[PDB]
Amino acid sequence: SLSTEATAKIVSEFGRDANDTGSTEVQVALLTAQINHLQGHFAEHKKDHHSRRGLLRMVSQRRKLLDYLKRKDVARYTRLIERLGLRR
Amino acid sequence: SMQDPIADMLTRIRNGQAANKAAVTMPSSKLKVAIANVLKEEGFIEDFKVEGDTKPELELTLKYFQGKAVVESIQRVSRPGLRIYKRKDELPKVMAGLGIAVVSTSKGVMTDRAARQAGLGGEIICYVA
RNA sequence: CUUACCACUUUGUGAUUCAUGACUGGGGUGAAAACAAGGUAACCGUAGGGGAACCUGCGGUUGG
RNA sequence: GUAAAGCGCACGCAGGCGGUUUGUUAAGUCAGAUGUGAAAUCCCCGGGCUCAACCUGGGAACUGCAUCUGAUACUGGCAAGCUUGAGUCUCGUAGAGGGGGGUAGAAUUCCAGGUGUAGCGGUGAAAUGCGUAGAGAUCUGGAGGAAUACCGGUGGCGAAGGCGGCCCCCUGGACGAAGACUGACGCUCAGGUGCGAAAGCGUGGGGAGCAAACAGGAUUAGAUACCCUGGUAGUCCACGCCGUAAACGAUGUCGACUUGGAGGUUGUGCCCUUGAGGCGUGGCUUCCGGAGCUAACGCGUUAAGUCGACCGCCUGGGGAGUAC
RNA sequence: UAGCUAGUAGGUGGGGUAACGGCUCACCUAGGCGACGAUCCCUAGCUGGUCUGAGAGGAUGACCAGCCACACUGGAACUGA
Numbered sequence: 110s111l112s113t114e115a116t117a118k119i120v121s122e123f124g125r126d127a128n129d130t131g132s133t134e135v136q137v138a139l140l141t142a143q144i145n146h147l148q149g150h151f152a153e154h155k156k157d158h159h160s161r162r163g164l165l166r167m168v169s170q171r172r173k174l175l176d177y178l179k180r181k182d183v184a185r186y187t188r189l190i191e192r193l194g195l196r197r
Numbered sequence: 198s199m200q201d202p203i204a205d206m207l208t209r210i211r212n213g214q215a216a217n218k219a220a221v222t223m224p225s226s227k228l229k230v231a232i233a234n235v236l237k238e239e240g241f242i243e244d245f246k247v248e249g250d251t252k253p254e255l256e257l258t259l260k261y262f263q264g265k266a267v268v269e270s271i272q273r274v275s276r277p278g279l280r281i282y283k284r285k286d287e288l289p290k291v292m293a294g295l296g297i298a299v300v301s302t303s304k305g306v307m308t309d310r311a312a313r314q315a316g317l318g319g320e321i322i323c324y325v326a
Numbered sequence: 327c328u329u330a331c332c333a334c335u336u337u338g339u340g341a342u343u344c345a346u347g348a349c350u351g352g353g354g355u356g357a358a359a360a361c362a363a364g365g366u367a368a369c370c371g372u373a374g375g376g377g378a379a380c381c382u383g384c385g386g387u388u389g390g
Numbered sequence: 391g392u393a394a395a396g397c398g399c400a401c402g403c404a405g406g407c408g409g410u411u412u413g414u415u416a417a418g419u420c421a422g423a424u425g426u427g428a429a430a431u432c433c434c435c436g437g438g439c440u441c442a443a444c445c446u447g448g449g450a451a452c453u454g455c456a457u458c459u460g461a462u463a464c465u466g467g468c469a470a471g472c473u474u475g476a477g478u479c480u481c482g483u484a485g486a487g488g489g490g491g492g493u494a495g496a497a498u499u500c501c502a503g504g505u506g507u508a509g510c511g512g513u514g515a516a517a518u519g520c521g522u523a524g525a526g527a528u529c530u531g532g533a534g535g536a537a538u539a540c541c542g543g544u545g546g547c548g549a550a551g552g553c554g555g556c557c558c559c560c561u562g563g564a565c566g567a568a569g570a571c572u573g574a575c576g577c578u579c580a581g582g583u584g585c586g587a588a589a590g591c592g593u594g595g596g597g598a599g600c601a602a603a604c605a606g607g608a609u610u611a612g613a614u615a616c617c618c619u620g621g622u623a624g625u626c627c628a629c630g631c632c633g634u635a636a637a638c639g640a641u642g643u644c645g646a647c648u649u650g651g652a653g654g655u656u657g658u659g660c661c662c663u664u665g666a667g668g669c670g671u672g673g674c675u676u677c678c679g680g681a682g683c684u685a686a687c688g689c690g691u692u693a694a695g696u697c698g699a700c701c702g703c704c705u706g707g708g709g710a711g712u713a714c
Numbered sequence: 715u716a717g718c719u720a721g722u723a724g725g726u727g728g729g730g731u732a733a734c735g736g737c738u739c740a741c742c743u744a745g746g747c748g749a750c751g752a753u754c755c756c757u758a759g760c761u762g763g764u765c766u767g768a769g770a771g772g773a774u775g776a777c778c779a780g781c782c783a784c785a786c787u788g789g790a791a792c793u794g795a
Contacts, residue, residue, distance in 0.1 A: 110560085110561065110562085113480085116478095116479075116480090120478090120479075120571095124571090128479075128480090128570060128571070129478090129479095129570090129571055130478045130480080130570065130571050130572080131477070131478040131479065131570080131571035131572035131573085132478080132571070133477095133478095133572070133573090133575075135478065135479085135571080136477070136478050136479095136572080136575095139478070139479090140478095147561080147562095149560095150489090150560065150561060151489090151561090153489090153490085153560080154488095154489045154490060154561090155489090156488095156489060156490090157488055157489040157490085157560090157561070157562085158488070158489085158584090158585065158586095159487055159488035159489085159548070159561090159562060159563085159585095160487090160488055160489075160560090160561045160563090161488090161561095161562085161584095162400085162401085162488095162548095162549080162562070162584095162585085163561085163562040164561095164562085165400095165401065165402095165584085166401085166562090166563090169401070170477080173477095173575070173576095174477085174478095174575070176575085177573095177574090177575040178575090180575085181573095181575080198409090198645055198646045198647090198697090198698065198699095199407095199409080199475075199644070199645040199646070199698075199699070200407055200408050200409090200576095200577075200698060200699045200700095201407090201408090201697085201698045201699070202409070202410095202646095202698090204697060204698045205645090205647080205697080205698070207697080208646070208647055208648095208696060208697040208698075209646080209647055209648095209696095209697095211696070211697085212646095212647050212648050212695090212696055212697085213647080213648080215648070215681075215682075215695095215696075216648050216649070216681085217649095218648085223646090224409080224410085224474070225410095226409085226410070227410090227411080228463080228464075231463075251473070251474085252473080252474060253410095272697095273698080275464085275465095276698070276699090277406095277407055277408070277465090277698080277699070278406085278407070278698085278699070278700090280418085280419085280465065282418085282419050282420075282464090282465095283420090284420070284421090285420080285421080300463090301419095301463045301464045301465095302420075302461090302462095302463060302464090303419080303420055303421080303461045303462045303463055303464085304420095304461075304462085304463075305462095305463050306463060307463090316421070316422095317420055317421055317461080318419085318420055318421085319419070319420060319464075320419070320420090320463080320464050320465080322464085332789080332790090333788060333789040333790085365514105365615090366616080370634105370635055370636050370637100371587095371588075371589080371635040371636095372588070372589040372634085372635090373588105373589060373602070373603100373623105373624095374603060374623100375602085375603065375604090375614090376614075381614105381616105382601100382603095383589095383600105383601065383602040383603095384587105384588060384589060384590105384601095384602085384624090384625085385588035385589070385635085386587075386588075386635065386636075386637090386638105387635095387638075387640100388636085388640105389638105389640085404749095405750105428762085428779090428780075429762090429778105429780090430762085430763095430778075430780105431762085431764090431778095431779100432763095432764105452762100580749100581749090
């Protein structure tokens, strides 16, 4: 649902260059933008459950990517979890 | 394959033999090539050949005496879930010596006869027969 | 002689069992037609009526 | 699968398992050594009892444990990669996927009126209940709720439950084509968490039809049969609870490999650059059947084949999914 | 049987002991153990061995040998290598 322009902005603003779509920082930033917006969605309706499932996939996959960063490179991970505001 | 690529290669061999296929292929590893060496020097296959640089592919060539495949059984023994290691005095005779066990010794991957000769055991990869 | 500790002992308070107890729980005992086409398939969950086992509602299954 | 046995369905922590190439280490592993593994017992060869049992000599065995030295294929570790798994991206397609928001008719009953007077009603049979006080039907408007006939399906989407009027808003997932990016980021999961038909519950409403209960008649061997006539909970909405089904493909999830034929649905490439087309090529899906497997029935590339990872489960029938 | 534990876990000093040690004490710290099963309940002497079994295993631990523990029950010490 998240617009193409927003994905381009995020890929730029967390990517190591332009069109590095697939690095963990890029992946996590897209997932966190989507989490925030959907949490906007489900605030108003709490009784959508088939869509909320896709949101649990987003959250779970984002935890898995963040755990991969922490294991691989701690420095980029710690820069990210606040440079994007995470592990609150 | 996903977790046991060596049972993958044996499954391919016995499935291709029961399918009367002339050659099977699979993504190569260096231990796949080692076991293939053991087999083709024991006369269980004709040949093999690894092509590709970033994606090598191991090209086993199956072998039929007439219309019957040379391998009757080929069973994985040590798997992820049970690793099997034998001391050289307890290396297994496979079909009373008529079939091999390929073991992984610390001097490489050899047959069972070769290992009990050189007085060193190791991890039992499979039973061929 | 007197402190410190303490086994046992007495009390209370607790837990835990043992027996037995009306009762249970009434298991009773004795006393006041159709064989998937066949008085209305075979089932599953649930809720009702009533001595129940049955029947009915609601959803479901083919193992009719 | 059906004999007992795949949790209703996911997601997921611990845990288990882990593509590929170097390097390293040397934990597992392997090898050698050494020390220890009491004696007896057991086993082998002997010896003594007249033989045997029994006794006894020597040996072997004690399948183990530790330590040292070595090996380094494999597993582990540590390091560094790789790109095939997994993912991110870009663009489109189909869809009863979901939550909302209004939306319209068919049918539905009464009223609002006339039009009409001997009927309305039903079973094994009446009858009970309506009506001549105007009863039904007609058109007329209303009221209000339920549900969306055709399309419609061998269809589709969803983890499963399940989803079907039209239209908008929000939203989820899937798939296809090339390309880019990451760089094993994976699979499975006890516990846990969440979803979960129907009935039911609780709290407020709503109540057009229906309909357990209950209320009339007749039952039948007696009737609290069956039935028909009304009919309340409920059904519907909001929130909370329940957490169960033959929740079923009675078939856990994931990956790989193994002959065919007949379809359906949805993409897409080449060439007919006519719309299909002819030839591909994907995803889903229905049905035959080969090997194989199966007790058989059957399954059969969507496997119940051949394998690998992890989980759940079973262990004669009843007692009993019961008691505590 | 899912939490258990205040010499509880550790530390400094005293003390004590043949000896190390929370062994004990004073103070300090606030730990330690537990889903690789703590705690709690139940059962049980342990082993070489024995029996059974092709084996893997099961079942046992009478005799004999080794180790433990006990000596009416519960406390306690003394003497002494």
